[PDB]
Amino acid sequence: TEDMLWTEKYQPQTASELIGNELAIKKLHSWLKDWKRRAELEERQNLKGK
Amino acid sequence: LSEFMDNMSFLDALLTDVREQNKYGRNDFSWTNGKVTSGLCDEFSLESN
Amino acid sequence: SLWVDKYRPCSLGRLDYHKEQAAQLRNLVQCGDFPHLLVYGPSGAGKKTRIMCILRELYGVGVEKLRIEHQTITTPSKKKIEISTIASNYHLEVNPSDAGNSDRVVIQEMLKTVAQSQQLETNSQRDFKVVLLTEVDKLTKDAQHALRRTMEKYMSTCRLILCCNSTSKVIPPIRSRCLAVRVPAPSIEDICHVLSTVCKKEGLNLPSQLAHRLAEKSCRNLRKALLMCEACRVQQYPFTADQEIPETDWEVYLRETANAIVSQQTPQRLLEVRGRLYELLTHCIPPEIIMKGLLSELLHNCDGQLKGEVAQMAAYYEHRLQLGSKAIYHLEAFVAKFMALYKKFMED
Amino acid sequence: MFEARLVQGSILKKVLEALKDLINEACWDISSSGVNLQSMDSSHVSLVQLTLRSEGFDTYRCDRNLAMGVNLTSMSKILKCAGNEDIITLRAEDNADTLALVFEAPNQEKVSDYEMKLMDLDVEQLGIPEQEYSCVVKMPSGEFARICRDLSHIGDAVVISCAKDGVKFSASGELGNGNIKLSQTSNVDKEEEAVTIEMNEPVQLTFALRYLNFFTKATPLSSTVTLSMSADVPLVVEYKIADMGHLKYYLAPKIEDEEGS
Amino acid sequence: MFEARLVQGSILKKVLEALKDLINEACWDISSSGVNLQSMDSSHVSLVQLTLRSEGFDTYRCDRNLAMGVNLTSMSKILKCAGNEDIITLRAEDNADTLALVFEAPNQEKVSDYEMKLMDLDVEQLGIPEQEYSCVVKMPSGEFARICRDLSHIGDAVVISCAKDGVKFSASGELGNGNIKLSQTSNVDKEEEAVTIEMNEPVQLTFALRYLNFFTKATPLSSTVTLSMSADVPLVVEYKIADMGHLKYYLAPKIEDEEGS
Amino acid sequence: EEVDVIFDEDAGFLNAIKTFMATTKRPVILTTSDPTFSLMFDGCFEEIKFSTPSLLNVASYLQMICLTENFRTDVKDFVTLLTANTCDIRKSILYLQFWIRSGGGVLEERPLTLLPKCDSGCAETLFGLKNIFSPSEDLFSFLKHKITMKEEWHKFIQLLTEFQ
Amino acid sequence: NASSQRSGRQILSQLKEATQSHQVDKQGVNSQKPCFFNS
Amino acid sequence: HYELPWVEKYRPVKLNEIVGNEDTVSRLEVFAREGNVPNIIIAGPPGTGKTTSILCLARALLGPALKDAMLELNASNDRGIDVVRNKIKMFAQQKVTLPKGRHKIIILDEADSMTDGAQQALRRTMEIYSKTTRFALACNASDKIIEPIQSRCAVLRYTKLTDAQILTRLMNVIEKERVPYTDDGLEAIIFTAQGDMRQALNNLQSTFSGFGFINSENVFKVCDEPHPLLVKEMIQHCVNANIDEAYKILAHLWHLGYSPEDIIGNIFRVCKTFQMAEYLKLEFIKEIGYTHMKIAEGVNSLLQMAGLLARLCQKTMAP
Amino acid sequence: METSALKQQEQPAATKIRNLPWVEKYRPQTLNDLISHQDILSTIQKFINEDRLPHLLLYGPPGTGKTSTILACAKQLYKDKEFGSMVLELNASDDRGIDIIRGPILSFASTRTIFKKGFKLVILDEADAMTQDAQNALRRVIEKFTENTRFCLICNYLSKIIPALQSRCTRFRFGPLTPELMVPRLEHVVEEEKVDISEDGMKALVTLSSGDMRRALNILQSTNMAFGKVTEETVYTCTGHPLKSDIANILDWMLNQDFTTAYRNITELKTLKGLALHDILTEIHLFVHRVDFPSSVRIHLLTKMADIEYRLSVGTNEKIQLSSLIAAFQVTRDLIVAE
Numbered sequence A: 001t002e003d004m005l006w007t008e009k010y011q012p013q014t015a016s017e018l019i020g021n022e023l024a025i026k027k028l029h030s031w032l033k034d035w036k037r038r039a040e041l042e043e044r045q046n047l048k049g050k
Numbered sequence B: 001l002s003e004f005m006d007n008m009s010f011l012d013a014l015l016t017d018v019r020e021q022n023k024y025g026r027n028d029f030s031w032t033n034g035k036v037t038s039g040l041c042d043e044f045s046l047e048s049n
Numbered sequence C: 001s002l003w004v005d006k007y008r009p010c011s012l013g014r015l016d017y018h019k020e021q022a023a024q025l026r027n028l029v030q031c032g033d034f035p036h037l038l039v040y041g042p043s044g045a046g047k048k049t050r051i052m053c054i055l056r057e058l059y060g061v062g063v064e065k066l067r068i069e070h071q072t073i074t075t076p077s078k079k080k081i082e083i084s085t086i087a088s089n090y091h092l093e094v095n096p097s098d099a100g101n102s103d104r105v106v107i108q109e110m111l112k113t114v115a116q117s118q119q120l121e122t123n124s125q126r127d128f129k130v131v132l133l134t135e136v137d138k139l140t141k142d143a144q145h146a147l148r149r150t151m152e153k154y155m156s157t158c159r160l161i162l163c164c165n166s167t168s169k170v171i172p173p174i175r176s177r178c179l180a181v182r183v184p185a186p187s188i189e190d191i192c193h194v195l196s197t198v199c200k201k202e203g204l205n206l207p208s209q210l211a212h213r214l215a216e217k218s219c220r221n222l223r224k225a226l227l228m229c230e231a232c233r234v235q236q237y238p239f240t241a242d243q244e245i246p247e248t249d250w251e252v253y254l255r256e257t258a259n260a261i262v263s264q265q266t267p268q269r270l271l272e273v274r275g276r277l278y279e280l281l282t283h284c285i286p287p288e289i290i291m292k293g294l295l296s297e298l299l300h301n302c303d304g305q306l307k308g309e310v311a312q313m314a315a316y317y318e319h320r321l322q323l324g325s326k327a328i329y330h331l332e333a334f335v336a337k338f339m340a341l342y343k344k345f346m347e348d
Numbered sequence D, E: 001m002f003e004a005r006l007v008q009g010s011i012l013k014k015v016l017e018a019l020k021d022l023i024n025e026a027c028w029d030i031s032s033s034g035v036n037l038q039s040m041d042s043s044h045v046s047l048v049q050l051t052l053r054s055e056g057f058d059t060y061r062c063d064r065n066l067a068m069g070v071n072l073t074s075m076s077k078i079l080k081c082a083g084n085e086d087i088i089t090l091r092a093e094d095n096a097d098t099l100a101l102v103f104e105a106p107n108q109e110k111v112s113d114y115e116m117k118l119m120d121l122d123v124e125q126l127g128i129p130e131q132e133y134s135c136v137v138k139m140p141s142g143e144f145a146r147i148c149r150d151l152s153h154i155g156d157a158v159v160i161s162c163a164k165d166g167v168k169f170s171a172s173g174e175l176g177n178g179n180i181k182l183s184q185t186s187n188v189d190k191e192e193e194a195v196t197i198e199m200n201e202p203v204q205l206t207f208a209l210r211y212l213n214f215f216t217k218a219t220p221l222s223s224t225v226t227l228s229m230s231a232d233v234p235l236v237v238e239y240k241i242a243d244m245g246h247l248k249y250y251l252a253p254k255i256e257d258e259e260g261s
Numbered sequence F: 001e002e003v004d005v006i007f008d009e010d011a012g013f014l015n016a017i018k019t020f021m022a023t024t025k026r027p028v029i030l031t032t033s034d035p036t037f038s039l040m041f042d043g044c045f046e047e048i049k050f051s052t053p054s055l056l057n058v059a060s061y062l063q064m065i066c067l068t069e070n071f072r073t074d075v076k077d078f079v080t081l082l083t084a085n086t087c088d089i090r091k092s093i094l095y096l097q098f099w100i101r102s103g104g105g106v107l108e109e110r111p112l113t114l115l116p117k118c119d120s121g122c123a124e125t126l127f128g129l130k131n132i133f134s135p136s137e138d139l140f141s142f143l144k145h146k147i148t149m150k151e152e153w154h155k156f157i158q159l160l161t162e163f164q
Numbered sequence G: 001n002a003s004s005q006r007s008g009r010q011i012l013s014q015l016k017e018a019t020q021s022h023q024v025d026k027q028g029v030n031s032q033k034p035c036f037f038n039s
Numbered sequence H: 001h002y003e004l005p006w007v008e009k010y011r012p013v014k015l016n017e018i019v020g021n022e023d024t025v026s027r028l029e030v031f032a033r034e035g036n037v038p039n040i041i042i043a044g045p046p047g048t049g050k051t052t053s054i055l056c057l058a059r060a061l062l063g064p065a066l067k068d069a070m071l072e073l074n075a076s077n078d079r080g081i082d083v084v085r086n087k088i089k090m091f092a093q094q095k096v097t098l099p100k101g102r103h104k105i106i107i108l109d110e111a112d113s114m115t116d117g118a119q120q121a122l123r124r125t126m127e128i129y130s131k132t133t134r135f136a137l138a139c140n141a142s143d144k145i146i147e148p149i150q151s152r153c154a155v156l157r158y159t160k161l162t163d164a165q166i167l168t169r170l171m172n173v174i175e176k177e178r179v180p181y182t183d184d185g186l187e188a189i190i191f192t193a194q195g196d197m198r199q200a201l202n203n204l205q206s207t208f209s210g211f212g213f214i215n216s217e218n219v220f221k222v223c224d225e226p227h228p229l230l231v232k233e234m235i236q237h238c239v240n241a242n243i244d245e246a247y248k249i250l251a252h253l254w255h256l257g258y259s260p261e262d263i264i265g266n267i268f269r270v271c272k273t274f275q276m277a278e279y280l281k282l283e284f285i286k287e288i289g290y291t292h293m294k295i296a297e298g299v300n301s302l303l304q305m306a307g308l309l310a311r312l313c314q315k316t317m318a319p
Numbered sequence I: 001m002e003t004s005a006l007k008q009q010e011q012p013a014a015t016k017i018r019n020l021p022w023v024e025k026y027r028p029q030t031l032n033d034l035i036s037h038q039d040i041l042s043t044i045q046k047f048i049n050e051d052r053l054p055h056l057l058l059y060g061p062p063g064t065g066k067t068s069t070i071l072a073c074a075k076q077l078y079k080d081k082e083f084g085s086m087v088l089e090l091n092a093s094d095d096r097g098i099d100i101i102r103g104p105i106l107s108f109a110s111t112r113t114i115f116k117k118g119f120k121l122v123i124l125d126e127a128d129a130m131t132q133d134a135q136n137a138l139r140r141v142i143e144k145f146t147e148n149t150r151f152c153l154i155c156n157y158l159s160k161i162i163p164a165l166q167s168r169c170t171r172f173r174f175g176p177l178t179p180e181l182m183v184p185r186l187e188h189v190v191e192e193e194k195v196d197i198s199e200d201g202m203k204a205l206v207t208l209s210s211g212d213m214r215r216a217l218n219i220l221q222s223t224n225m226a227f228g229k230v231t232e233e234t235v236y237t238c239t240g241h242p243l244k245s246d247i248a249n250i251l252d253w254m255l256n257q258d259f260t261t262a263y264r265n266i267t268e269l270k271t272l273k274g275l276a277l278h279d280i281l282t283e284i285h286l287f288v289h290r291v292d293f294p295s296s297v298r299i300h301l302l303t304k305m306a307d308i309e310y311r312l313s314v315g316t317n318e319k320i321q322l323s324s325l326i327a328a329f330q331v332t333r334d335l336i337v338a339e
């Protein structure tokens, strides 16, 4: 009855579900946090301009 | 045990192996290279194996 | 920058030993049409520094700067191989033995690019670029045939320098067209001279007894002597005549391996000796060096009639090691046959 | 069962020539109300909203709301053979893997039954809802494309700044500076050439030109165009065809790395 | 001793560009009635036959039958620098292995001359009996190239059928099956040609794209084409050139197998 | 994804991604498995290296995966599978899916407190050794006993040549 | 990815505006994966 | 009217008609009965039933939808870099209405012949479109398939067919073809096909067409290997340390025109099942392997084979 | 492309006033003319005449009559009015990679006949030169078009063909001829050409050619124009083969006198006759089984000589290997004689 592979059935949707390499996923998650912060700062600056 | 492992050295040295060992790098436990990436070109090998 | 390369001579006049050979190489350079060189001799003899002196005599001071470049060559079996390379404006240095049986995939191609550069680069100094070939004794039969055809094809284009330790594996065709430069190991007094000169240039003084002990422990290896002198400098600020020269760690590990082989002859001890040899192999120690060290440390405990049989067995299994691929089989096969023979000798 | 009969397919050929390089795939969201084509480009910065009324066809029939995704390059392949005076039929089964297009040549009997496999989109209609735009500008199409041509000769980033008199186009390039202004030409003979401004508050944005080239490659489809621009919303470029539907085109403005004080 | 006087360089230009990559060599055999050229593709799937009458040349004169075989790489390279409107002459010896092509002056100031070698091949007379064909149609030439380009750019093999309505071209490619039907009453206005049939029994076959497109490469030789098909007798496309003489192509259909259970 | 894979049709891809590198305002990720590319590519990028994960952690993760699918397994079989697959998580997950949805390995009972029957034997069928042996035959039980009859001699030969 | 045609002018002219500009659809169905290609 | 080959005439149509590799065939059977098969790579020797198993699996999974939901690409097709990037990718993105648990199948037969760049492009397009499409690869040497392709699939292993299974299928074909036979001809057909079912069927059909009866002399007349009776007699002479008679047989084989390669191959194949002691068999196999390596390196003369017989004689004559 | 005008020009090519093409003088035209492999040509006729011709794999040592045989079958099956349209003869001489399989062969096999309806045939010469993946494509082409076209693969060594290609075809080995039946043909050509050969020269011709007709004609013709008469010394000197007297004297030196004198004599003879150690080893090995040795002596000599021949292959010093060859006899047979 199932129709997808287990690699995408049990695909980690949240970064904490990655097994091992916790320093690497910590660095990547942190770096994307600064990039999302910069995107939100750009949006805030755009709305403050107008 | 010594006779068996002499026979195994006989097999490793004096018999043909299926996959040609140290084909692109040298033997095991080497530091100089070992980063043999696979092929990246669409032309065929045209080898005489 | 240790003492081995900080005080490496740069010209043929600053060499301390083989001075007649240095003058002969200078006269070779001054003729203007020096041939392919086949430099050979033991390790630590001084082949590389003499080749560097030859290169500095040929071209200007610009060979003293070096740069590392990586070359990715496509194999005819369509699997690209990337190798490192030390080079300069005037010379190239390569070690194609790192490419396994694809060493010819370097040899037929790499020097060709240099030949391409010889029709691309123009300097009006000399009509060739020197290609240095390190560990040419480790090439295969077809690699050496490729090298032969390569020096035939680009004779007037580039010159070849082949540095090796043994000319046994190289083919007689590759020797029939290269001038042979045999660099023997320096004597004990020569190593003492070099050690005293290197210590004086650093500002220290070492006694003649310590220098003689270092030269005797080096086994006529100048580089090993310099490294051991630097280690003795690290251990003690002044050089005393009774200062203990520190020993090589893998050498003493091989010595305890030989003692464990001699002490008990059991399958359990055979397994621990196999584990020790695996530990040495994982340290990138070459298996031929391990076999030579094992034979050197096992012949002390042997008896006179046993010595010839043990040496012949070690040579047999080292030839098997050369023929095969997984060297632990031949190493431990020699080991186990030695324990069997030694046990049979000790029961009678 | 979906069945549509474009009485004339010159406008279909010219709109696929307008959208031949921008969007990767085209979806049909086909209902009883009409035919919807909401397509997002490969860069996901622009959007195309092509809407065809049911009365704009000869016969239009749709039993159930359906959606198909085909690719643009195959549509470029089929529609090269389309003439300018010809009848075009679009046919689809109720639950089909394929879409048919019947091209009836002006000969007595020369039929091109051109069939094309669907390509299985996982994306539905995606667009902003109706919201009141501060600046609404009616302005001709040919001189829009002419302005885009000269400014694309000038530079690679424009500032669009609405004003009381019109809307100013500014650009700074390495060749020079290109600035153009728009004035009211409402007191003119043709209503297409007439320019009227319904601007409410002054906004300004930074845009990309090649996008304006695909924007304005839809030139001869409509006489005049309507620009809707407000605060922090995509530019809406609106072409209303006569009793034959209308198309909206959406630009997302370039981001600005604003510096603090 | 063979001499031929080709009236227009366009005829030899288009004949050489027709057989450009279909064939490996050309072996012309001369006769009192005219000159002939029959040979076959290196893949042994297509036959090219070409007959030129004596009266078509201005001065055609021969002594005895002789066949000359030239590889067409050299002669195509030579003939690519020939005038379209110019008048050409061909001359060969009785036993020498060199053939001379002399092009007259295109600028009325430089007569061009060139020579090719000769290589002998096993080219025997493929004596096909001309069986009565069950499907003979007449159809425009440029239209045939257009339709073959439309079909061959989607799929790999073109299915050609000849039913009671007329001819039918189909291609079930990986993109989607394209299909155009032509009829008896369908007469085009581009060349003012009407599709007519002389068919007895309907036959349906399938062919490769490349050889059919190479057949279409000989478009401007005639205003009309006769297509000839039968249940066994293979695909024939034939061009009846102005005056007399004709160009004749045989293509072998692919083998079609029934699907398994 | 897979920046080290450069074809002749991908003309100037390295120059294009360098032009991307210079003139971007949004984050860019490069994913590769060739270790040389980080030395070959020129430009400023933050290096992130995924080391090989611990065998016990991925073994317990696959134990979780099989436990959710109502399958009970031992950690030793998973350790063998991951050692054979050199700790490839995707390859292990895919082979586990194939082997579970086929009906598991063999019905054997093992009492562990540390209950349905356990399902050891995944690494045996991973190498295709179940295609040679009867399903009542263990590999080590086959190796320990002496071999006399021709058929299991052929079984031994087939085992060794499949591993050779 | 390597499964699609990525030549330099192709990826430039079709993906610079993703980095240099905003997204037209900011709300709704956004966290998807459009794999860039041009058949 | 046309004579179909018995290889194709008696091809299995159902997955339960496939002998050998019972575990993997049964797993494929339950996947065909259930559905949701993952991406698989079937590796093994030729003639063992990999293409047949994949075709029967796809047939059972699809049925009437096999005509449009299946894309097969063998080594006779292009399967280039542009083919992988275009044709396979549009078939992967193609919409096909299928029952639940059924996916489109992309069979890539002879994935060894697939170019490395084609596989490198195949990686991601096999990974992402797995919700609607599946990949079934078949190969002989799995080492020729690059590592990410093996990582994105499930590797299934096929082995050589046991002579019992080849005998059962041979009896199945014989009892549906009115083939007169004897036991020695069956042993000869099984010997001439070492673990191959295609070679067994082809040799059976060739012997039936050439002579009409299945005995050993007919099989070895139509197949023309060095006769296993001669090689067995030579090995028996070497066991008794009779260099003269063993060399007489070897020189007779050499003057019959047999190459060194098939002579040493038949020597190994006969010696594998020869009835002698284990130590003598081990020394014989070691010396045969050394001589076979010497033949493969390039030195292949009667001196090499005479030196082997002699190294085989001195194995027994000396302790 | 091309590579066909040379053969067509070569077939009626002779000076016809001075040249003597002895090999091309006596060629069979049909299967009733090639008096060799009667079982093979009979079963080929039995396959063709009843419309059950399978895929054929013709192999064997070269010069045994394979290409002309299949040319005779192709000409007797298909008339000249339809021969080129439905018989496609290619080889590995025209190789640009593997394109020939997906090009001419795949196009030819996948289409029907043009003029006369029937089955087509592909001749493929030196098929062992193909790569493994080219054969993997060819077997698929053969498998899916087996009803329309049949294939005939002519190779030299069967070991270079993949097992599936061998599985699709029935194999025919063209072995060397029993040296006896070759003699009638040699008496025929000497009676035609009026030459002087003794029986010993006949023995030399049948032992040098190893069942090859063309090489026998070449050697006989060359020795005839060189000397005008053929005895064993005359053919062996023109051939440059180790003479039986020289090998017998080498064996006598290695059996009779000491190490140094035999070594010097053998080195002198090798430099004198241009003799290599490989051919010395071959002829001495042939001499070993015709000389009455004990079984242990024969085993020792064969093992040692095989080891020396292996050592010569890797490129060692030929002088030291010659000393080892002398040593192999000095170990056993000299002290057996002196006992």
Ligand SMILES: Nc1ncnc2c1ncn2[C@@H]1O[C@H](COP(=O)(O)OP(=O)(O)OP(O)(O)=S)[C@@H](O)[C@H]1O
Binding pocket: H006, H007, H008, H010, H011, H012, H017, H018, H019, H020, H045, H046, H047, H048, H049, H050, H051, H052, H053, H139, H140, H169, H197, H198, H201, I164
């Ligand atoms: N296990 C089997 N059971 C029954 N018949 C078989 C079996 N294996 C092979 N055959 C027969 O042999 C023919 C060829 O089998 P294939 O499946 O084509 O071999 P293969 O596994 O594809 O190996 P290749 O193609 O050389 S890599 C089939 O059509 C069957 O008639």
Ligand SMILES: Nc1ncnc2c1ncn2[C@@H]1O[C@H](COP(=O)(O)OP(=O)(O)OP(O)(O)=S)[C@@H](O)[C@H]1O
Binding pocket: I023, I024, I026, I027, I028, I034, I035, I036, I061, I062, I063, I064, I065, I066, I067, I068, I069, I174, I177, I213, I214
């Ligand atoms: N048994 C034979 N008796 C007489 N002449 C023979 C015999 N075998 C070959 N020939 C001659 O060899 C010629 C060519 O035969 P081919 O079939 O071409 O030989 P082949 O076995 O195919 O090996 P090739 O062609 O050299 S690779 C014939 O025309 C004969 O003159």
Ligand SMILES: Nc1ncnc2c1ncn2[C@@H]1O[C@H](COP(=O)(O)OP(=O)(O)O)[C@@H](O)[C@H]1O
Binding pocket: C003, C004, C005, C007, C008, C009, C014, C015, C016, C017, C041, C042, C043, C044, C045, C046, C047, C048, C049, C050, C194, C222, C223
């Ligand atoms: N004439 C010399 N004077 C001083 N030091 C030397 C002299 N010759 C060699 N050396 C030292 O000995 C070492 C020799 O190493 P190298 O040139 O690599 O020889 P090899 O290649 O034989 O190992 C160098 O490190 C160098 O510093």
Ligand SMILES: [Mg+2]
Binding pocket: H050, H051, H052, H109
């Ligand atoms: Mg198969």
Ligand SMILES: [Mg+2]
Binding pocket: I063, I066, I067, I068, I154
């Ligand atoms: Mg031949």
